[PDB]
C-alpha cells in the first residue's frame, strides 16, 4: 500500500493506493492507535469493511501531538494488510482551498472558500502574477474570506493562485483575468 494523509477543507483525509487491481472492488477496514499509551487498535467506524479508498479522520485524529499508527486490512479471496505511521505536523499535505476571482477596473476581488477547532499553524498566501512576475500576498479561517489585489491596470492579464503555507506547498490551479 501507498498512503497519503491530506488536509482538504480542514478535513483530515487518509487515502491509499494498492499495487495490484482487484476486478471486484476491494473491501477495506482501517484500524489505528497512538504510541503514547498502550491502547488497543481501534476500528474507524465509518471506515470498516468499506469499498472507499480513503477515510475521513477528522473526528478521530484530534491532536497534532501523537504518533499515529495505522493498520489497513483489505479483502481483494486475497487478504492483505499494510501498516504505517504518521506525524501530522510533518506528513500532512495541505491542499489548496477553492477560490474565485472577479476583475474590476483597477482591482481584483479574491474570494477564498473556507468552511464554517483547528490544530494547524497555517497561513493563507495569495499569488498575483502578471508580465512574468509573481507577487505574494499574505492576508492577516472560517467561511468565505475576501482579499483585494489593488492598484492594477487595464489590458493586463493577471493570474491568481492560492495556497496554505505551514516545507513545500501545494498551489491551486491558476485563475486569470483581464480588467474590464
Amino acid at each position: 500500500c501507498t498512503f497519503k494523509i491530506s488536509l482538504r477543507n480542514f478535513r483530515s483525509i487518509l487515502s491509499w493506493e494498492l499495487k495490484n487491481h482487484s476486478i471486484v472492488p476491494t473491501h477495506y477496514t482501517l484500524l489505528y492507535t497512538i504510541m503514547s499509551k498502550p491502547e488497543d487498535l481501534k476500528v474507524v467506524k465509518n471506515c470498516a469493511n468499506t469499498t472507499r479508498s480513503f477515510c475521513d479522520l477528522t473526528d478521530e485524529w484530534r491532536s497534532t501531538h501523537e504518533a499515529y499508527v495505522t493498520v489497513l486490512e483489505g479483502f481483494s479471496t486475497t487478504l492483505f494488510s499494510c501498516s504505517h505511521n504518521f506525524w501530522l505536523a510533518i506528513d500532512m499535505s495541505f491542499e489548496p482551498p477553492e477560490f474565485e476571482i472577479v476583475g474590476f477596473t483597477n482591482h481584483i476581488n479574491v474570494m477564498v472558500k473556507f468552511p464554517s477547532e483547528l490544530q494547524f499553524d497555517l497561513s493563507l498566501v495569495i499569488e498575483e502574477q502578471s508580465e512574468g512576475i509573481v507577487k505574494k500576498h499574505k492576508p492577516e479561517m472560517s467561511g468565505n474570506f475576501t482579499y483585494i489585489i489593488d492598484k492594477l491596470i487595464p489590458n493586463t492579464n493577471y493570474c491568481v493562485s492560492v495556497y496554505l503555507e505551514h516545507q513545500a506547498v501545494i498551489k491551486s490551479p491558476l485563475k486569470c483575468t483581464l480588467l474590464p
Binding site: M35, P38, T64, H65, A67, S83, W87
Partner: protein, 127 residues
C-alpha cells in the same frame, strides 16, 4: 522556531523500524504537560533530551549523521533560550524513560517507543 520543526523532522527520520511491530512495548511515561516563567523548564527539557540521545546506547541505536543534525538543533535552541518543582517533575520523567530503556535492554522497539515519546513531549512543550 523552524528549529522546533527541524527537531521533529529529524526525530521522524531517525525511525529504523515499523511502529506496528513495536506496539507491545508502548508505555505511558506520564509526561507532566501541565508544566507547559516556563522557559527554564523548556531549557531543562531540551537539555535532558540532549543528554538522553548522547549516551553510548543512543549512539548504537541511531544514525550518526542524523544524530549530529539533531544535536545541532538542540544546541541552537538552548543557545536561544539561555540568552533569554517543575524542573524536578521533568527530571523524574526522564528517570522514568531511562529506567524503561534499562528494563527493556535498549531493544530496537524500546528505542522507537522512546523516540516517539520524545517527539510528543518536545512538541507539547514547544507549542
Amino acid at each position: 522556531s523552524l528549529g522546533s520543526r527541524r527537531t521533529l523532522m529529524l526525530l521522524a527520520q531517525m525511525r529504523r523500524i515499523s511502529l506496528f511491530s513495536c506496539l507491545k512495548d508502548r508505555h505511558d511515561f506520564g509526561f507532566p504537560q501541565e508544566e507547559f516563567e516556563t522557559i527554564p523548564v523548556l531549557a531543562a527539557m531540551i537539555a535532558q533530551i540532549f543528554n538522553l540521545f548522547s549516551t553510548k546506547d543512543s549512539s548504537a541505536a541511531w544514525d550518526e549523521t542524523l544524530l549530529d543534525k539533531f544535536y545541532t538543533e538542540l544546541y541552537q535552541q538552548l543557545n536561544d533560550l539561555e540568552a533569554c518543582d517543575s524542573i524536578l517533575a521533568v527530571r523524574k520523567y526522564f528517570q522514568r524513560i531511562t529506567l524503561y530503556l534499562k528494563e527493556k535492554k535498549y531493544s530496537p522497539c524500546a528505542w522507537e517507543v522512546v523516540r516517539a515519546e520524545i517527539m510528543r513531549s518536545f512538541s507539547l512543550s514547544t507549542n
